[PDB]
């Protein structure tokens, strides 16, 4: 990863090439609350669908949901995770989850620098409540960090971005939050496709982490 | 304004005009090249069952003349609409760069199937290159064919002629010229028909050979 | 490895080439357990068939079947042994096969991201009970993981996942899974070829893994 | 629509279309070519164990003229199949990439040798390259003889030359003409099975260069 | 000295000097190529509509030589401007160095597509390339038609030539030399939009192909 | 990074092309006192406002404005602010702001000296007070450092110096001062544009750093 | 079916074809070559030791005409042989690939100098390339022989030319083409021999060019 | 001595020596050129403007002699000066090395484009080359028009032709040659400053390519 | 950094190309002392003028003046710096400077051997005194040293030998020294091009160092 003649990283360019093919996920702010919803590209009824899910639990405070190559996403997840616990041990808790992506992010970067090792091809949504409040950050490949209202990655972002900028509005209660989120994510879905069942999560002020069960999901569709 | 300028070229010739030309070549002119190799295969019929003397030097044959001015006519059109794509294209080639070249690769690659298809396909050019002329006939086939029967008639209508190879010749004129439209008319098509393929899979890049995401800074 | 202006991986889908040249393996799940059949590439009479199985235990509740590089194959599963003793020392148990498979798929992983070495050019299909149940997972070059009801690696993949696509039903008897996987395996040799008695190996909740013997396996031939 | 303009292209001319030329070109194809062969080599034998006057400069002989029209009758054959597997691979030839183009060589491959078999071969086109004509005789084999020929013929008709060279050209000219159809034939078989090998080996790439099968992201 | 013998260069031709053409070009330059091309049009379809006899061998047709006359004119006025522009670049090409050349890069970039223009384009050379001529007709249009008319009228007008094909061919040469200036013109058009666009696109590159700002150093 | 012929280290200037590409900031000192002014890429209603952050305290005397790749710069903060508190340790304050600043530069300068890695494409402001007086240096990717009156760095830099160079006079007091930066940054916009509001933070000796909230800044606008 | 119509294709054109080839020419061939060799020397000889007339533009050698005659029937057979070693290496060319070409490079290799010798040491092409015609001689050198003396034959014989030097350039005619004929063998003699000897060091890896041994993968 | 016959021819072709000619090119040599232009301009529209009959072919005109002999003479004379310049740069050309070669690319840059000027723009050669005759009109410019009006002078006065486009092609030759001229004077002017520029800016390492400071050595 | 067939190092001849672009610098022994005079690029009004000094104290006793990469200068002048002051550490004064100048010389040969990094484009004078004298050094990017009685480096470096190598005279006064080094420098500049206060430091025998005030060069212009 070196500079070309214009100041561009190509390698980094092109991780973000990879993540643009993932599954289009979506975070965003609700009265007290965040929520994620992710799609998934079922692709045969072999498969078990409960297994390997987009929306991972980092702590009972905070979730992420990747796009882009499915491995490198394991391993970021699997840092977040530890890194939030060795935050937990020396402080006794995680007050501000900025600082956790921060470290994600951090670890991202460092991959773009150093010779020897690729970029990550992943991006990250990170969800979660924290001392300021719901937080909803996103992470690239660069370990570029936004923090965010609404906010959407993979291959359908323009789109659900698109109409979030449009319909989004904030404090809204949680079932309409959900409500428009899945209207924003059946805005991206191509010529006819019909959205299958995504996966659910939310937070509230006070409380932990809720996914919501297939049964549940449905009751949206 | 440079900027109005540019943008005054790329509004007056839009991906609709390259797409226009596109559709016309995958039905109207495909079916017109077809009728006339049809055409030239009667005529190339009616001469293989002929036998020549020199009545056949005192007049050239107007069904062999319709042929070939028939197969300029499409000629002519398809140039003008190749010039349309190739217009389309080369007024969207960006900055020149030593990056960011994926799409413009594209540009390139479709404008040389484009020139191909113009210089050595439909022999549009004066003199042809180093390459030589390597479809059956080019554009001027027409004038081609008078310039090569005039010879061989001023020859065996004079004190004529006696050679009988010489108004063999004659006859073989007429066939061959008729067969070079056969041949070139299936040359043709199956070169309209990879640029049809080629435009429809790349034109994206061929109108934006570069997408703007400078999400890295600030 | 390092990514194309596409944000694909070369390097990882070529060792993805070495694995469809594997032979045919695959599993499924039946009524409580799993099980595994693998073809043999047998090429010489002089080979002694009763080794160098193509079906590896990793402990006696859990099983893997390879295809592809058989050097790379042999040092993964040495790896997921060690790694199930270590689990099994420091907890007492193996709780959920899950996090060995992503052990194993972590090291192949880093395999694609660092300079210096080239991938692994194998996939592992594991099978066996865990506390959740009977448990069925795949792992391919990339470290890409997905947990099924049925599966298959190798060069007959395609045509035995269409046909288990069709034919496939849960929670079958144990003799009616293993006379579906001889079927399927059968019709992934197109031309006129006969299947020579491959390797069956299966597990039910309550019970340690269990290697059908050479006579036992000709029963369903 | 984009999408069906390419299906509508790609369903015309299928894999179907180019096999049942291959079929061909392996049965009847070769055994015509054989068969002309044949035809050029007896009339070559003739034309030895002959002794030329000026009465031969008087008619064409009709033995040899059937030898090469019947060649040039297989060679513009030979030109239309070889486009339609032109056509089948042509409109095949994927988006362009600077990856993932191990198949895009393949369909290039294939289709220089068919571009060799049908501008150097058969000698199509109507000017030879800087690479010159390598075949013994082109697609107007016809028109060369006759030409040839009638220039000889006039010399020796008239005041009617006096060389006795010129007539023993005359008789070279119809021996030269056989052997060249020997020749070619012997050439033309040899590039048509190896097309024939090309294509059956590589067909799966030259149909479908690109294989997807996306299973890294998510 | 020196540096006032360069500045004295540089400041004769100017940016502005290039521009003014660049403007011209996008204006009134196109403009007179589609008048041209619309005169070509109306004067090849009063000969398509002809029967010509010797009378036409009589008179040179003085439609055509004005429209053959105005193409030359306006290939005239675009080769000076073209000159312009080169030498706007041409005297701005930096010291040579083995770095530093991106933005040479782009010097040499255009001043090919311009090369391209007058060499190929507007076939002004006294003689062409290996790569042949690919326009239609070049500069010296007006000769090439004259020169290639006197031929055949003097074989029609003598011991008169009886040719049939010979007549037909003098008004394919009246035809096809409308024809090539439509060609020509269309070929022309898409040429010139593509030079303004790489102006336009690339002219600060052009004027200031390197960039100083060396605070590394003390 | 390595010399060409002419001595020069093109990929230190190429790092210096992604600078360019950054947002505008500013620095300027005043009548006993620094101040700091940044412009801010905002586009979307989706994105948060408050946790955007483009001057950063480094401590509570000393902040940086930065310019180019976003994660580079994060990281050089994050180095910055533990270096600061390492001084403070050592020898109980930061007595001069330029050796602090030098360790920054010189972190930059080893990443154009030594292979493996490429340069940082970063450009930073330094502003503060120290037992010298108020301080305001900038450093770049070249790890190149000076001291001035009044500088900027980012896409509208050049604008900005000229302003500067035409209408800057010291000893100002802040209000003029902060609304002389303001007249700066604007006239570094393009034709007919606001300038929605920027960050602005400043200093004087005897206090520590202020950061001027939405609506104090909106007075300037 | 495609793999049968590949195996008859391999099976209709063996190694024991090709072999077949070089085992004859490794005899006969050369002892043939050898033979027109001298007797070649042995007309060129006469013609030295003679002064020529107008009687012998009055008739054409017979003895010059059995030693050119010879050759081309050499020639003939050498390309025919030629091809059928040809056709053994292109119908075994394997999949086209980017790798694992090793043997394939040594397909292409003597395919490249058997199509040396057909086409510039035979001289075997209708017209020689841009690389000339390196053989002092080629196929049609009957012919050859037959156009350069029948122009002077006419010159001479009308009333005839007084030209002294004419006079000698029949001779020398007579002569040179006995030369090339001696220099053409023996150039013909080191490039049968070239190959031969590539053949029998490469033909494993022509009639094999890969070979398998997947012990690897399981 | 070595090294004194090197001094000698050194000291007899100095940086002064091409100083001189490019001050003079910058001053007289553009002002001579942009003069031989108007003529040219003028004696063209004098001709535009004419009606000509045979008494045209019976007289060369003046006028236009006169504008082609001061155009040669100028030629002649940029000729020999580029000569000098090329002089002193080659002579110059130091030790052949595989390094210290950048100013010996600079060296080599600046004679390639000297080369061009004297071979392609002026046509000074006997013979152009693959490349073709870029320059409207060469050197030997005199010869080319006289070469060119003698054939249509001698067709048209004998009878006389009686090709009506044979005597406009008379005034086409006599028009196309000065337009030819403006083209050239035109082109010529674009190198020159081209070379002035380049001189100029690279004088130093022409002289001294490669600069002595063994500094890490003792 | 390997060799040429001609045995030359080129990555160290173009890093002296580096050298060349920079300010020109003196040196010159007078009696009982020496003294280093240095030109400076100030551009800008916005610049701090009293800062980042082209002349900079190594010890009290030792200062140097650099020329090429500012950066690669700072931190050859921090080594040279700490080298001093473990020498001092080590034995309790600095007994000859020379050996100083050789340990920061032989950090830069390391860098013309080992690869991985490139040369410092960096040219320096060490002048001061010890217990020899006074010394005047010069080292280059090869890491060469020369001794000398007078010296000079940067883009002047040639005009300023062959001024001083016809006027210069052993055992001046320092007035007349400084006069000298002034008009040295001068003959430097560019047809036209004045001098604009230049630093001035000297060293006398059982002196320390002495920087020259802005009023007391003035006096010498």
Same mark, same amino acid.
């Given at each position: 990863t070196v500079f070309s003649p214009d100041g561009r990283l190509f390698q980094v360019e092109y991780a973000r090439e990879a993540v643009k093919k993932g599954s289009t996920a979506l975070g965003?702010?609700?009265a007290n609350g965040v929520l994620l919803i992710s799609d998934k590209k079922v692709r045969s009824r072999l498969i078990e669908q409960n297994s390997i899910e987009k929306i991972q639990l980092i702590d009972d405070y905070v $979730? $992420?949901?990747? /796009?882009?190559?499915v491995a490198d996403a394991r391993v970021l997840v699997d840092f977040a995770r530890i890194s939030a616990q060795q935050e937990k041990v020396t402080y006794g808790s995680l007050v501000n989850i900025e600082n956790l992506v921060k470290r994600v992010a951090d670890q991202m970067q460092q991959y773009t620098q150093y010779g020897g090792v690729r970029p990550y091809g992943? /991006?990250?949504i990170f969800a979660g409540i924290d001392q300021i409040g719901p937080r909803l950050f996103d992470c690239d490949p660069a370990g570029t960090i936004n923090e965010y209202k609404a906010t959407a990655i993979g291959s359908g972002k323009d789109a659900v971005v698109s109409f979030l900028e449009r319909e989004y509005k904030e404090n809204l209660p949680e079932k309409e939050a959900v409500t428009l989120g899945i209207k924003a994510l059946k805005s991206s879905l191509e010529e006819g496709e019909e959205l299958k069942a995504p996966e659910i999560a939310s937070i509230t002020v006070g409380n932990k982490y809720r996914i919501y069960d297939q049964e549940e999901v449905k009751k949206f569709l | 304004k440079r900027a109005a300028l540019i943008q005054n070229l790329r509004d007056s010739y839009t991906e609709t005009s390259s797409f226009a030309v596109i559709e016309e070549w995958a039905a109207g002119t495909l079916q017109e090249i077809e009728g006339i190799a049809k055409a030239a295969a009667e005529a190339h019929? &009616?001469?293989?069952?002929?036998?020549y003397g020199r009545a056949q030097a005192e007049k050239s044959p107007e069904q062999l003349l319709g042929v070939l001015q028939r197969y300029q006519d499409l000629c002519h059109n398809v140039y003008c609409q190749a010039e349309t794509i190739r217009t389309v294209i080369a007024i969207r080639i960006p900055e020149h760069k030593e990056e960011d070249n994926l799409g413009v690769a594209v540009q390139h690659a479709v404008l040389k199937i484009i020139d191909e298809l113009e210089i050595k396909t439909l022999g549009s050019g004066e003199k042809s290159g180093s390459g030589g002329a390597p479809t059956? *006939?080019?554009? =001027?086939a027409l004038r081609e064919y008078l310039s090569a029967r005039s010879t061989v008639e001023d020859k065996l209508l004079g004190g004529g002629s006696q050679s009988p190879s010489l108004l063999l010749e004659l006859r073989q004129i007429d066939a061959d010229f008729m067969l070079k439209v056969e041949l070139a008319?299936?040359?043709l098509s199956t070169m309209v028909?990879? &640029? *049809?393929?080629? =435009?429809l899979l790349n034109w994206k890049k061929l109108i934006q050979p570069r997408t703007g995401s400078d999400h890295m800074v600030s």
């Open positions: 965003m702010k609700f $979730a $992420a949901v990747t /796009s882009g190559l992943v /991006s990250l | 019929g &009616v001469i293989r069952n002929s036998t059956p *006939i080019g554009m =001027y008319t299936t040359h028909r990879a &640029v *049809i393929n080629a =435009y």
